[PDB]
Design a protein around this ligand. Structure first.
Ligand code: CHL
Ligand code: CHL
Ligand code: CHL
Ligand code: CHL
Ligand code: CLA
Ligand code: CLA
Ligand code: CLA
Ligand code: CLA
Ligand code: CLA
Ligand SMILES: CC1=C[C@H](O)CC(C)(C)[C@H]1/C=C/C(C)=C/C=C/C(C)=C/C=C/C=C(C)/C=C/C=C(\C)CCC1=C(C)C[C@H](O)CC1(C)C
Lengths: 200, 196, 197
């Protein structure tokens, strides 16, 4: 259901853009799960540490990646020994791209499917293996599907936000949010347009 | 008649961007009217006041929109710092929200005048002179969409130019007329847009 | 395996991303890319011959005059200028290119009328002077040109993008990258902030 605006892929069509390829539905949902994780990560990283997500791109560089050690709120220990440099960027990126590429190739059937029970390639939400808690079978899986997709679109809008705010304010989404909640009259996009977004 | 590149929706129907729905034709002509009003409003704003159109909002302020009071040439817009930005905004939100709800039909009908909800240029009521019936309607809609498209392209130019020159549309007009060959787009790029 | 790269060619198979139903854009991709390949190729050739970036090569010429190119070419036995004037080369450029466009798209009559249909992107009847069209099979050679066409369009997009980020020039960016690839790339230039941040 979409009383707010638009509709879901199963029924109806967007007047703003024709449906086109089907696989856009699959593409949209995965994009949204990713933006959910990205926005939440931006939110929580800048909540605990304070640094914006976009600046946090340089959180690890081939010369400087041991900086990340113990950069987590309340973390029991640092990620790696402090000042060792053993948490090199080369290592952490290699491990990352290995685990991601394996997950994505198993997702899309590039390589194989290690699990032998269904798990059809090309589905948003199989739920054989990727539902350990049984909340889909518990009920309202379809309601949860609409809920999922709406959270997807909201989070992609939020991520497009966080990108835009970075491009204009250069301050970070939570810092912008705190500034807006403190004095909403004089902390908005248009007063930043009046200052000229820095570039003007 | 539309003897120009492309084709009006419902005619020959040969678009660059695929014709997804009629509703895009509706959005084009409605964007076109608002861009018509935007272009002529900017033109009159800065030939009268002398400021860039985009800074007009900057000249108004939430605390003092009396900064824009009586900016109109040849005319007391308001007597005290009475005109507030929220004041004009709440009058505004009511009027434009009514008019839009009335146009699309989310609210009830204003009147039982034979009007068709959701259709452009229905005419009759919205034509006090009756030009729609006095002239043949078809070529008149062609002119409607043609001027709509021209003003939209003008508005796209004005926004991108406010981004480029940072001086406003008359300033581009004046820079271009006083020196056509130099002080143009490619000289502005040559000397830099202020960033390079 | 002809075109195992991502996607499919316009003649056969629907795209993987953007659906389409018009053959006009299928024509247009290959001409846009051909124009790109000439642009990108000239990017190296010019930037290597003169040692300046292509985007400042545009403004090297002024409306008042265009003499900067005189003896700017590498190995020129005689400079092209002896009227090194922009408008003198402009009218001849716009007339020659305009005529070419009219002749290739059908605005004006073809000067040869050798059967080259303007609608056809491959009027080999007068084109491919070497005659490689008939020396080898045409289909594979269509694919090869197309692949390069897409390659060079993406390279032009990336070229212009790097132009806007670093303003140092595509091949100067290349030299900086190969000099120290670890600490010279898009992400370290974004760490500097592309100059604007
Ligand atoms: C006694 C242990 C412990 C405590 C009290 C906290 C306390 C907190 N953590 Mg931390 N954390 C702890 C261990 C760890 N945290 C993290 C990683 C994170 C993350 C990723 C996040 C927190 C968040 C939060 C919150 C709150 C301040 C969240 C936060 O930022 O909320 C403000 C959050 O997103 N912690 C790791 C893995 C390295 C830990 C290992 O045990
Ligand atoms: C059609 C509606 C409409 C449009 C297109 C604009 C357009 C603009 N206004 Mg205006 N306004 C509009 C309605 C209204 N404005 C105002 C009151 C103001 C103020 C008070 C201010 C603006 C400003 C601006 C600019 C800032 C845009 C921006 O943040 O990012 C620019 C970039 C993009 C949007 C990317 C594309 C822009 C030229 C600001 C400005 O000009 O400061 C320089 C400003 O301070 N507007 C009111 C009264 C409620 C309006 C009614 O809706
Ligand atoms: C009666 C005397 C008086 C005089 C001589 C002018 C003279 C002018 N007015 Mg003003 N105005 C006057 C009264 C008023 N004007 C306005 C509202 C406007 C607007 C909205 C506009 C003008 C514009 C103009 C200019 C061109 C008008 C045409 O031609 C010119 C400078 C126009 C302008 O700036 O040039 C396009 C314009 O757009 N005037 C109002 C309120 C409705 C008035 C009420 O008395
Ligand atoms: C004696 C003749 C002669 C010699 C040795 C060179 C030598 C050179 N020219 Mg020059 N040119 C010569 C005549 C001419 N060139 C040009 C115009 C160009 C162009 C347009 C280009 C060269 C390029 C090159 C280089 C070949 C690529 C390696 C090399 C440095 C190429 C180059 O430097 O690319 C990096 C290149 O693109 N030359 C023209 C036409 C005005 C010539 C007419 O005689
Ligand atoms: C890259 C992300 C992404 C993708 C792949 C899609 C894909 C889709 N969306 Mg989603 N959507 C997105 C972003 C995206 N959307 C965001 C951020 C919003 C919030 C404003 C929405 C809001 C939205 C609504 C309200 C609706 C859709 C609909 C659709 C379908 C329309 C087909 C289409 O042309 O889209 C292909 C993707 C694009 C054209 C990319 C968008 C680029 C813009 C034009 C710039 C398709 C499944 C409609 C639907 O379910 O169809 C029945 C529908 O009703 N979406
Ligand atoms: C918040 C929005 C949201 C919602 C409503 C859903 C809803 C759904 N998802 Mg989707 N999903 C989301 C976000 C969401 N998901 C994101 C961000 C990802 C990427 C990680 C996925 C990845 C995903 C996959 C791969 C699959 C689903 C499936 C499902 C369905 C069953 C699971 C369920 O009930 O989720 C309920 C969601 C919530 C209750 C949201 C709250 C999330 C909390 C705050 C996080 C708690 C995490 C923590 C580890 C909990 C530990 C508890 C124990 C101690 C249901 C349609 C499965 C399915 O339909 O199979 C048939 C399936 O295969 N989803
Ligand atoms: C406000 C923007 C806007 C919108 C929504 C439209 C919508 C439309 N135009 Mg109009 N048009 C516009 C701006 C716009 N135009 C401008 C500025 C020009 C230049 C003057 C034109 C020139 C023009 C011509 C010459 C033609 C159209 C055509 C069309 C139709 C097909 C395209 C379509 O549905 O997808 C539009 C969807 C989009 C996402 C916009 C494209 C993205 C751009 C590049 C950004 C549709 C009625 C064609 C038509 O009606 O054929 C029958 C046609 O022949 N338009
Ligand atoms: C990678 C480079 C490359 C390759 C493999 C080809 C390959 C081919 N071209 Mg393309 N072409 C290229 C560069 C290339 N061309 C460039 C830069 C231009 C613009 C000058 C053209 C302009 C062009 C025309 C105008 C024609 C070809 C033709 C041909 C065919 C025979 C030669 C074949 C499809 C001919 C063809 O296919 O006709 C049957 C033909 O008519 N091509
Ligand atoms: C034909 C493709 C191509 C090639 C070979 C290059 C090559 C290069 N680019 Mg360019 N670039 C490209 C496309 C390309 N770019 C595109 C499409 C964009 C726009 C997204 C950019 C935007 C860009 C920026 C903004 C910068 C470079 C830089 C560089 C250099 C650093 C190493 C590198 O590639 O990281 C760059 C790789 C990418 C940006 C990924 C390509 C785009 C993906 C596929 C999306 C190198 C000379 C940097 C430089 O000048 O180094 C000194 C630099 O600052 N590139
Ligand atoms: C966690 C975190 C912390 C670190 O510190 C830094 C870090 C970078 C690592 C970071 C990690 C980041 C990650 C993983 C991000 C993932 C992002 C993703 C996948 C975003 C998706 C973005 C999606 C967009 C734009 C879509 C736009 C589409 C739009 C508007 C149109 C929608 C639309 C449709 C089709 C039909 C309607 O009817 C009408 C309209 C036209 C409106």
């Amino acid at each position: 259901i979409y009383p707010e605006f638009g509709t879901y892929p199963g029924g109806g069509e967007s007047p703003i853009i024709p449906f086109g390829s089907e696989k856009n539905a699959e593409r949209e949902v995965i994009h949204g799960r990713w933006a959910m994780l990205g926005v939440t990560g931006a939110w929580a990283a800048e909540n605990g540490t304070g640094i914006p997500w976009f600046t946090a791109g340089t959180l690890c560089t081939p010369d400087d990646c041991t900086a990340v050690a113990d950069k987590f709120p309340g973390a029991v220990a640092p990620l790696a020994p402090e000042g060792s440099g053993y948490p090199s960027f080369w290592n952490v990126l290699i491990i990352e791209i290995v685990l991601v590429g394996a997950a994505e190739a198993y997702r899309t059937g590039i390589s194989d499917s290690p699990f032998d029970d269904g798990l059809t390639v090309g589905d948003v939400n199989p739920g054989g293996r990727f539902d350990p808690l049984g909340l889909a079978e518990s009920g309202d899986l379809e309601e949860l599907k609409i809920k999922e997709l709406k959270h997807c679109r909201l989070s992609m809008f939020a991520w497009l936000g966080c990108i835009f705010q970075a491009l204009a304010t250069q301050e970070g989404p939570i810092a912008n949010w705190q500034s807006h909640v403190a004095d909403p009259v004089h902390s908005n996009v248009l007063t930043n347009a009046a200052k000229g977004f820095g570039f003007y």
